[PDB]
Design a protein around this ligand. Sequence first.
Ligand SMILES: [Zn+2]
Lengths: 50, 84, 70, 62, 122, 193
Amino acid sequence: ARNKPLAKKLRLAKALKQNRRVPVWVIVKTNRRVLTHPKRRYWRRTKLKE
Amino acid sequence: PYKVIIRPVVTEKAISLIEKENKLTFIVDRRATKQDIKRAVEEIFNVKVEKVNTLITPRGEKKAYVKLKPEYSASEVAARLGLF
Amino acid sequence: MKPSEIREMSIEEIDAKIRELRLQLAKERGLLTMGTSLENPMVIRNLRRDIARLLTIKKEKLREREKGKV
Amino acid sequence: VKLKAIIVKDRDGEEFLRCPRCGMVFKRRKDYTKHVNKAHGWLFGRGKPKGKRLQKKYLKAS
Amino acid sequence: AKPSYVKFEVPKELAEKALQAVEIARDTGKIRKGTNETTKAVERGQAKLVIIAEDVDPEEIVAHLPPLCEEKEIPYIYVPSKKELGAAAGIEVAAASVAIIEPGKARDLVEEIAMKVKELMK
Amino acid sequence: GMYKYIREAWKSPKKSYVGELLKQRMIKWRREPVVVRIERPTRLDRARALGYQAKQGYVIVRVRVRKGGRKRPRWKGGRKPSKMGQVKYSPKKSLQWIAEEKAARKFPNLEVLNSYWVGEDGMYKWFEVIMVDPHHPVIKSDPKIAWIALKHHKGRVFRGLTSAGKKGRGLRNKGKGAEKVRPSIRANEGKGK
RNA sequence: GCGAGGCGCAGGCAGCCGUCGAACCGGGGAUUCCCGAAUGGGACCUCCCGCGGCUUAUGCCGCACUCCGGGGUUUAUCCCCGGAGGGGGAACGCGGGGAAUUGAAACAUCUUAGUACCCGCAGGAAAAGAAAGCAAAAGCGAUGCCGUGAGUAGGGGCGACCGAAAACGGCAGAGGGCAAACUGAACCCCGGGCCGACGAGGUUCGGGGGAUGUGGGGUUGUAGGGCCCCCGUAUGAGACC
RNA sequence: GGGGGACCCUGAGUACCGUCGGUUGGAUAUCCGGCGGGAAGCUGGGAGGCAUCGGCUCCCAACCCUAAAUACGUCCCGAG
Ligand SMILES: [Zn+2]
């Protein structure tokens, strides 16, 4: 964990960026039809695939 | 010129660095090396670079601290870029 | 910018314009990250597509010049 | 019966001339014409078919 | 070292004389170049002398020439260099055998070669 | 011609000089690699009859194989008595076909045209394989052999389209007894062989 | 091409593009990071380290293994030019290796089954294909597919079960080339030139092959073909590029 | 383009025999493979469901290629 290969670090960065909420303006645009996406994650509960 | 520089960093830490240590903070492209960053800064801004430090943020982007020589002011370059 | 006016200028002018557009694009990205008064949110898109047009027409000129010379 | 050449492609993608009467493949037009004139020329009154069985079949058809 | 189809040892002088006879026959007579043509000439009984190469591999090409020549009463001699035999025959490629049908202006040379072959082993 | 004489000589090698020559040649060959290209064919008449020509793009390869059948690997799961045999088994492809496939493996850019027997001792068997280069302009320009240049003639030995392959598939028989051999072994439930 | 809107699923803010014809549609181009057959060398991380020419330098072009056709020499498979194979594809195809539950009311020959599955090899189809065949009052005349022959001939602890072809009626129809007899460099490929139209074709030079045979001819059954002899034909008539 | 010949050519560890294993409805008469033997070759050779002899009939292997009628549907029109 302290020492990380660059590719693994980049993959972790991509997952971190992936994890975020749905924009409120997107919710408004879809008219409360799109609220959540499958890729939400909790670090302690839902672990990364790698 | 060139594709090394993506965008200046306008954060409070960056501004403090410009004010104190004659350092400019940039977000550059990943494959760029320290020589590439130094050359890009020198050519674009017509300034002399004393040192370059680089890191890769947890978001996967490369950030460079470029410390200019005492002969040139980083505040002038920030003003030219609109950093304020 | 328009493809006709881009074709009007020479390769060296195209390279100079590409450099200026790249620098301005970096400046505008920094300004976007800094401020909130985004008067023209489409400036980034326009600059990027102008860069693409300039590079495409430069490549076209290179290829046509090579074909004509050969 | 017409004997116009049919074009085929090899592994490298070059061109061949395929006879539509027997399927033989050539790369040279001279050889294609020579084969078309020498092998199937009996169909136009120039020569006779080869083989007792083939001759019997052709006579029966005629 | 010597292939089995060679039935005797020929001196360098005799081999070079045979090569010269082949050259003169080519220039001012009739020769047959190649194993197939030489075999056909021997079978038809027209060749007055046969020249073979000592470096023919595989030797099945010329393994029948000595028995055939003995049966048909035709002198046959060996020469070391297949490529030089072909060059003397006049072609641009090596020849494994040659036959002389019309001596031309090498009649005495071929007669003496035949006599020497008879003395050696016929 | 010389071709008939070569054929007569190789009729029965033990009854001519070819016997001693083959003994010496086998002594030489036992020390050579299993697959080796050679400059010229040993049996010129056989090579010519099978389709060899003295032009660029043709290759002659000598291949050595071991005599006998095959021993099946030991079975690990339970088996009924009818399926336990290991020793008295023979390959369904002839040793000539196997040698041709070995030559094909050695040379990946060529196609196996034909093969013929060239000698055998009490342990090994030797075959000479004629192979062609489909990408050579000289080969392409020859209408006799140019058909190999077409796409659907790839891996012909592996699919069983050589003379040995046809013999193994039973395509040399017609009429009675050849009901399950056409149009293919698979097409007849793979039970005609 | 269409003709006033456009900025995906996706109904918002702001702004921009379009009548110099956008969006959109069909065709052709440009860009196309990294790994991946992955190939100059390595992978405990899809990231790194290399060697030579060109270039002022930026920055480009070459260097995997197994072979084919050439050249050089150092003879080292060492270097240079040209060209191949590698991996993928839902089902179908071709060639090999090959079980048991299960049925027989148990079970070993058998069945399951040349099946599941494994290895190898192609294409848009593949394989087969032109008789040393099929049939005998007659005869037919390449291959492939369907109907039928037929649960028949036949196999089988003659137990359970397994199991065709010919003929006949249809679809579709197509037949050709080698080895040898004989001739003997009259031949093929790569690059260049010339005449032709830029093509077909003709001719010429250099290189690589070729007498261990390039090219010409020849492909068949009471026979066919080479060679020899005799009669005539070609003036004409095809076919193809 | 036709007639005659008395000369030459027409595929070898191949066809085929014995034995062993697999496979097949192939049953003393299927096909493939291994081992040990193995010809004629045009005055020639092969097949006709046990083997051999004679007659008759039908053919010329041991080299090569071949479209259309067919199999499939990743995919595309159309239909229920
Ligand atoms: Zn044809």
